[PDB]
Amino acid sequence: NISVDLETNYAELVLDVGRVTLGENSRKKMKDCKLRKKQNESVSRAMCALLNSGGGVIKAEIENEDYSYTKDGIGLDLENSFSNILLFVPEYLDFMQNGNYFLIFVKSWSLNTSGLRITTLSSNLYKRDITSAKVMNATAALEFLKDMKKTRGRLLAKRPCVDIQEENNMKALAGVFFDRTELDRKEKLTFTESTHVEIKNFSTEKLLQRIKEILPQYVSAFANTDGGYLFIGLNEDKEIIGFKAEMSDLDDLEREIEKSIRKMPVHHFCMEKKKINYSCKFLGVYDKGSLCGYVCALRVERFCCAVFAKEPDSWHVKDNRVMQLTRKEWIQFMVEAERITYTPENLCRKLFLQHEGLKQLICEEMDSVRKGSLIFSRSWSVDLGLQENHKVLCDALLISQDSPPVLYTFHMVQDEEFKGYSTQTALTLKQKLAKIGGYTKKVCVMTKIFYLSPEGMTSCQYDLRSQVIYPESYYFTRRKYLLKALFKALKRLKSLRDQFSF
Amino acid sequence: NISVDLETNYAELVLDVGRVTLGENSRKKMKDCKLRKKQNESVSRAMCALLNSGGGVIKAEIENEDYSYTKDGIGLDLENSFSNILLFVPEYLDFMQNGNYFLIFVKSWSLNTSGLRITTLSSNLYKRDITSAKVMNATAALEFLKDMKKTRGRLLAKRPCVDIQEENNMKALAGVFFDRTELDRKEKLTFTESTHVEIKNFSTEKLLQRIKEILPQYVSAFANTDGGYLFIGLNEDKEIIGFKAEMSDLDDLEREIEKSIRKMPVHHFCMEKKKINYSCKFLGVYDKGSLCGYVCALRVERFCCAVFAKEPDSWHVKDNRVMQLTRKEWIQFMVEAERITYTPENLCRKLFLQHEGLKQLICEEMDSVRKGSLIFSRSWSVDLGLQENHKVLCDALLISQDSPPVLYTFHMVQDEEFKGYSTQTALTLKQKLAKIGGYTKKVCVMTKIFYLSPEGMTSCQYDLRSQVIYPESYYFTRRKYLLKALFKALKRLKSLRDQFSF
Ligand SMILES: [Zn+2]
Ligand SMILES: [Zn+2]
């Protein structure tokens, strides 16, 4: 339910997430928790997509009435989600209440010391923290995947006769318990939970519902750490209780378990692809010579490669659509490493000689600039990898320290509008600077469109800066770093010919 | 209250943490929460010290009686602490209940994709997560410190006249509120908490106690992110309440705030050292023409470098003492990057010719080894940087795939014991292999001591393997990786002359 806004005046990706309730008191008092979680999920997905797609704006309609950002705030859950996604929120996020809408300006994710290339809401990779199954964070998932990639995946020793207790004792006891044909009710186990043992108690009515939900994460955790045994039908005090069911119910539960396990995504770094080796068994529980219920014992063998509970929760924007990254793409991102100067001189001279009014217009525009660089091109759209527009005479990019980059479009057609072309070119330039260029600061690109009359009259048809508003951080840019990022982006785009004079 | 155990037979650092209650039920039912937290802190400090000092063993006396590791477990809080310290607990930790003691075998911390060189319980660096002050994790602290080190530390722009609301509005409103000479009781604020605003309500009796405790972390968070304003004396609904106090109480509170702020550690990456720029003000609250109480407003300016709430909580073992890393050392670690083969041939030939029984003893010992490498030295203690023992004839290190490394000490003195020398040499060798060598797997070093009689009689005085027990993971080692780590350690120790023949 996230759509790219094509009617916006901003020269960047604007994602509309629909009506969102804002304010700490307003969000904490929302009666419908499902709606609040859905709004949080939509905002988080939009933020992740913008982080992975070169930055942009999240536009949310303010659902609650009489909302003031200064007086109310944002909301604890949204802030917690932002903190989970981003280590330093002020470095990436800006908030602005514009009329009835809330704008979250999101900077592109930049490679840092952590080594992460993309942002993930949840890697859906689980591990065993001695007794608990926890979803690997970005750093843990990165380390796990790189270690498995490097190694293409992943008897007894004589010891002194000393009476010791280890996790191997619990694993052996659980294995012996697994092979028991029948069980006795109200008997205590000789083992407890460990890296290879998990014990859960579920009601009969909720068992089928929870098998589709919690079993995948425990199976992923076991297959990722060392394998293990999951026992369902034992209470907190390790007493055998079980759940009452019929043979048909047992068959249906076994089928559901098989479907849930086979649905789990699996990525292999080895040459020999393998399935998840699991064994499901049902042990009858006998009380006073009568069958009380059944205990479900699931043995999950150690897996050679990554096992996912669900597809990794990473998003991006492609073809003006918010798409979740496929497992292969996510794995590839995780494991695979990465005065005024008028240039070029020849093109500037040709443009100034062919069109006399263009030079006067450039001088008038640049009289207000303290120091900067102006780069001319026949079509800046082509240099960014987009389609050429033959009606545009030329494009000019201005990089100055006191102002954000400005793209100057010039056209000879009086009755045609070039707002969309210039906006798309500026959006692509910003994305290339952020991702390919390597610029690590907040950057926005403004546009100015001019009509060059044959008699030399110049008029400013469109001025982007006077129609859109940004946080102040976007209005101050580092000229040297901008030039370096532009040089790197042009070099990587195979469109660097004479933009920088050496 | 953590001491290095010098009476242990293990050839590694054994840290005794005293009596520790173990078991999930036992620990969750502990009446004294202070004692439980103290035990958890001691175990965590010992684990961090062992991780930073080349690995070792944590020995804890089992306080509770009738404790079985297989039946009871470890404890939720201890497991959570271990998970916080280590991304993958099974990769580093092994647990063993030996008699009345509990042994935690800890592998040395190895450099990984995260870039961390040491482990920290808490960096004590705080940041602002929009409304909350949170302690930077290891990755966040690493990124923050490296960014500040790289840059040697760390007007208005014209915008369209659009009615918008940002965090700057809240900051300006808080600044205006800061300069007010007097306040009126039961009036609502025009701003709320943000990246630059924190609002807390404290009782009069607990105000002095909490100033020494919670003020440093908020001051650190403000000085680390963007500065801000802290307001004490306002309830949840942003109504001005204040706290009743006298002028002497105000002076004492101001002195306590000054002492607390000046006590905070500060590290500077810039040339010009600066103090924490803060301003403390007390605003009277007037109700019906009478003074009700006072509101404390603290303005913390943005700081140029790192501000610590406390010294970073990182530990190591030096001179057989568990010492907390100093701030300078912690900063330096964070920000600054890093058949049977008989060698050497000449020394082996000389030893075999001088002592005939030595060759026979070596052959008898190596007849049981499938494949490995034996390296002889005049004194392996010298090659590891320790003091030479002239009574020891020679030392031999055996590296095999089926067995852990074994150090063979040979002596001609019948009435003297060399257990301590061999144990210290093995401990130093293990530490050098783990840290300097770069070995990333669990490794233990056994020792065997032999007496070479002048007539050629050989006797095994001490055999370490038969007297100590390790988890099975320590009994299987990678021979090629062990040789590579040994080569790297010898090269970095300037003691590599002819150990490996090329
Ligand atoms: Zn595989
Ligand atoms: Zn400084």
Numbering used by the authors:
A (entry chain A), B (entry chain B): 2 to 155, 162 to 345, 387 to 550
Copy the relevant paper text.
DNMDP and related compounds, or velcrins, induce complex formation between the phosphodiesterase PDE3A and the SLFN12 protein, leading to a cytotoxic response in cancer cells that express elevated levels of both proteins. PDE3A is a well-characterized cyclic nucleotide phosphodiesterase (PDE) that hydrolyzes cAMP, cGMP, and cUMP8,9. Moreover, we demonstrate that SLFN12 is an RNase, that PDE3A binding increases SLFN12 RNase activity, and that SLFN12 RNase activity is required for DNMDP response.
The dynamic motion of the two bodies necessitated refinement of each protein dimer separately utilizing the multi-body refinement approach in RELION25, with the final resolution for the maps for SLFN12 and PDE3ACAT being 2.76 and 2.97 Å, respectively. The regions between 346 and 386 and beyond residue 561 were not visible in the maps, suggesting that they adopted multiple conformations. The structure of the SLFN12 monomers can be divided into an NTD and C-terminal domain (CTD), which comprise residues 1–345 and 387–560, respectively. The SLFN12-NTD can be further sub-divided into an N-lobe, C-lobe, and two bridging domains (BDs). The overall structure of the SLFN12-NTD is very similar to the rat SLFN13-NTD, with an RMSD of main chain atoms of 0.55 and 0.75 Å for the individual N-lobes and C-lobes, respectively. The SLFN12-CTD is comprised of a core domain between residues 387–541 and the PDE3A interacting region (PIR), between residues 551 and 560. The interactions are centered around four residues from each monomer: T71, F89, I131, and I517.
